[PDB]
Enzyme design. Structure first.
Site, PDB file in Angstrom:
ATOM      1  N   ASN A 191       0.851  -1.234   0.000  1.00  0.00           N
ATOM      2  CA  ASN A 191       0.000   0.000   0.000  1.00  0.00           C
ATOM      3  C   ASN A 191       0.871   1.264   0.000  1.00  0.00           C
ATOM      4  O   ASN A 191       0.314   2.349   0.011  1.00  0.00           O
ATOM      5  CB  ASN A 191      -0.936   0.065   1.216  1.00  0.00           C
ATOM      6  CG  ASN A 191      -1.849  -1.137   1.355  1.00  0.00           C
ATOM      7  OD1 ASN A 191      -2.077  -1.628   2.463  1.00  0.00           O
ATOM      8  ND2 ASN A 191      -2.370  -1.622   0.238  1.00  0.00           N
ATOM      9  N   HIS A 225       2.484   2.291   2.559  1.00  0.00           N
ATOM     10  CA  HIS A 225       2.483   2.777   3.956  1.00  0.00           C
ATOM     11  C   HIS A 225       3.692   2.167   4.670  1.00  0.00           C
ATOM     12  O   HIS A 225       4.094   1.024   4.323  1.00  0.00           O
ATOM     13  CB  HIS A 225       1.145   2.458   4.626  1.00  0.00           C
ATOM     14  CG  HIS A 225       0.047   3.316   4.084  1.00  0.00           C
ATOM     15  ND1 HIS A 225      -0.480   4.375   4.793  1.00  0.00           N
ATOM     16  CD2 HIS A 225      -0.573   3.317   2.880  1.00  0.00           C
ATOM     17  CE1 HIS A 225      -1.407   4.971   4.060  1.00  0.00           C
ATOM     18  NE2 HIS A 225      -1.473   4.353   2.878  1.00  0.00           N
ATOM     19  N   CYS A 232       4.070   7.578  10.352  1.00  0.00           N
ATOM     20  CA  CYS A 232       5.189   8.203   9.618  1.00  0.00           C
ATOM     21  C   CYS A 232       4.890   8.064   8.114  1.00  0.00           C
ATOM     22  O   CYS A 232       4.696   6.940   7.644  1.00  0.00           O
ATOM     23  CB  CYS A 232       6.510   7.541   9.994  1.00  0.00           C
ATOM     24  SG  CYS A 232       7.935   8.195   9.097  1.00  0.00           S
TER      25      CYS A 232
END
Ligand SMILES: NCc1noc(-c2ccccc2F)n1
Ligand SMILES: NCc1noc(-c2ccccc2F)n1
EC number: 3.1.2.14
Lengths: 269, 268
Positions: free
Chosen positions: B190, B192, B227
């Site tokens: 993804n 992430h 983050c």
């Protein structure tokens, strides 16, 4: 995995894990490189050599000698998808006194078609002094009964990209990623930076738009000097080119000591 | 791996790899954390939920809802050695409208002895607006046929380590590692940042002398905010003592909190 029938090669199957895949939902080249070194280790283990990444004999252990990678060359035709089973066959061959080659062939376990191949050149180094030396005959012969005596090459072709000379990137670089540092997960059991980490660092200066619109077909990386636990790295890339090609340089962020150079070749999806 | 007989739990075996171990030739806590996530995903796959780390229903997909980790808690008694087989069993249970728990038990395959256990709290979040929301009754019901009905706890004991409140480390920290940044290998499919990366970042401010003379027994980590790919993190640690530490991750600029945690270490 197991040694093959003739005892001169080693085969192992891997199921690609959720956390091993990128945005394409296939294995990253870093996962591939990790699996190459895993089967390499298991091959060493299977025949009584050291399993610390250095694949040493008693003779070499007595003399504080190790094998270190001089060059990695990886060529991928299809990246295995998450849940897919990839089979890897690996073997070594001496190149006389220069050092040794480890080669790999990757296959779709289901179809048995070749999906990638890799080769690596290793040299013998005193662990303590970092001085290279030619392989002695006593040490050579220890290894020869574990290697095919007829040439067996992942890269047979007369002039092949695996053996090309890599030039030194000239400033200014087209692209850069500054201030790269290893964390503990980047270190092996010897607290040395893992060779795959340097692949990650090379690819960090490839623009995201290339990674989103291309797949990595070929990477060639020379290893000159190791990044220590406490070193900081700058990653430099320049376009040299439907195919995209890049020249790459890793160097220490302070004095600009070279640790690696490489090339990559990318094809539009 | 496979669902167990009653279909309410999932089991998988893992051979520890050369590159997965630290200086003691046993698996790192990050290798363990990655295998927890892998068996979690294979469990989601085995019953038709999404395989993207979010384990969503078709309903949640229409509403752009995801499951996000609020807390990881991991307790290890023995780290598996290189070439050893570890068996991980895992299951989920609803905690009503608050969210859900995934629990794991780690065993030595050869002895069948318990070598660790973990638990995690997950909350439901709109993936675009990042707003929390209590779990829908229609969504609860989709998941209840795949979870045990009687309470099944990796950590049964009332007021155990896994449920304790973690306080906010106050400046100055005893130890820091500053300017930490994720690389492409720290991202999932993804794009992430992978949850295990925050574990590595917490541990980067433990002094090497501790890592060299101790083994990590317990880690508790709260996840407050992500983050991003282009964020820079500072890792802060203070001795609160066995050795114990309080941990804080925060953005390198403005000092926005992303994680707080504790670790417990025993002399070898
Ligand atoms: N040619 C030198 C050489 N270096 O390693 C080997 C090797 C062979 C089989 C299994 C593991 C091995 F490490 N050979
Ligand atoms: N309680 C909510 C819940 N959330 O996930 C699950 C879940 C259950 C079985 C297999 C995979 C799963 F993701 N349940």
């Amino acid at each position: 995995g197991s040694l093959t029938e003739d005892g001169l090669s080693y085969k192992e199957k891997f199921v690609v894990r959720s956390y091993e895949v990128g945005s394409n939902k296939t294995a990253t080249v870093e996962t591939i490189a990790n699996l190459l070194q895993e089967v390499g280790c298991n091959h060493a283990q299977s025949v009584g050599f050291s399993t610390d990444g250095f694949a040493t004999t008693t003779t070499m252990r007595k003399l504080h000698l190790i094998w270190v990678t001089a060059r990695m060359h990886i060529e991928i035709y299809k990246y295995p998808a998450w849940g897919d089973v990839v089979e890897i066959e690996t073997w070594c061959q001496s190149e006389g006194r220069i050092g040794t080659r480890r080669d790999w062939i990757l296959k779709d376990s289901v179809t048995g078609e070749v999906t990638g191949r890799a080769t690596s050149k290793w040299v013998m180094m005193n662990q303590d002094t970092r001085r290279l030396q030619k392989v002695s005959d006593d040490v050579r012969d220890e290894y020869l009964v574990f290697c095919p005596q007829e040439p067996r090459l992942a890269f047979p072709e007369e002039n092949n990209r695996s053996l090309k000379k890599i030039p030194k990137l000239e400033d200014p670089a087209q692209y850069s990623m500054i201030g790269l540092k290893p964390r503990r997960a980047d270190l092996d059991m010897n607290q040395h930076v893992n060779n795959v980490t340097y692949i990650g660092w090379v690819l960090e200066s490839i623009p995201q738009e290339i990674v989103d619109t291309h797949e990595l077909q070929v990477i060639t990386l020379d290893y000159r000097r190791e990044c220590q636990q406490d070193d900081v790295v700058d990653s430099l890339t320049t376009t040299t080119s439907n195919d995209s090609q890049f020249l790459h340089l890793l160097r220490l962020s302070g004095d600009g000591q070279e640790i690696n150079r490489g090339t990559t070749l990318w094809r539009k999806k």
